[PDB]
Amino acid sequence: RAKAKTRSSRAGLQFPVGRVHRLLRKGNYSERVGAGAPVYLAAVLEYLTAEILELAGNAARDNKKTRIIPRHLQLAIRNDEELNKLLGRVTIAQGGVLPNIQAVLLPK
């Protein structure tokens, strides 16, 4: 037996692969979990979360801010059609709505 380290580190991964391996069995999704499946799901969750976290940081950068709030997260969704589709059934607490006007409202 040896001094422990995360299985994610050998996979090249940033989230806890061990508890993903727990959740995939303990949630009764199948009788067996393949050795790659929790590594793969951690990689998928990380990839998609990092992709939206750049848009979150960029939404704060656009508003010239340094601390993320739910408004920057709503702006991150409304800056990308993949997120506008994926999160189309999602409510963001205190995120508000994208500011928009139909041209008919405008004077002249």
Binding site: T91, A93, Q94, G96, P99, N100, Q102, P107
Partner: protein, 91 residues
Amino acid sequence: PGTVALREIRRYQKSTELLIRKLPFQRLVREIAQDFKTDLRFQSSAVMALQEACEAYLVGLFEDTNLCAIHAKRVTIMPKDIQLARRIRGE
């Protein structure tokens, strides 16, 4: 003039906090719960999760009603624009 309401649009679209008064909403939530069933009581977080879902749902209804009125060549909403916005959603 009759049109500087367009500045209210931009202010309340910049703003992102909840708009209905918490006490009136909590009173209504409790009244609707209590004539439904006995001794149901709400954590503050449940009343907030309700109110956020309600106000997001009504912002969606008003966006949908806006497009119905714009489609009807109006600049005004009448209860019939809401009744289209329900039937066209299947609500």
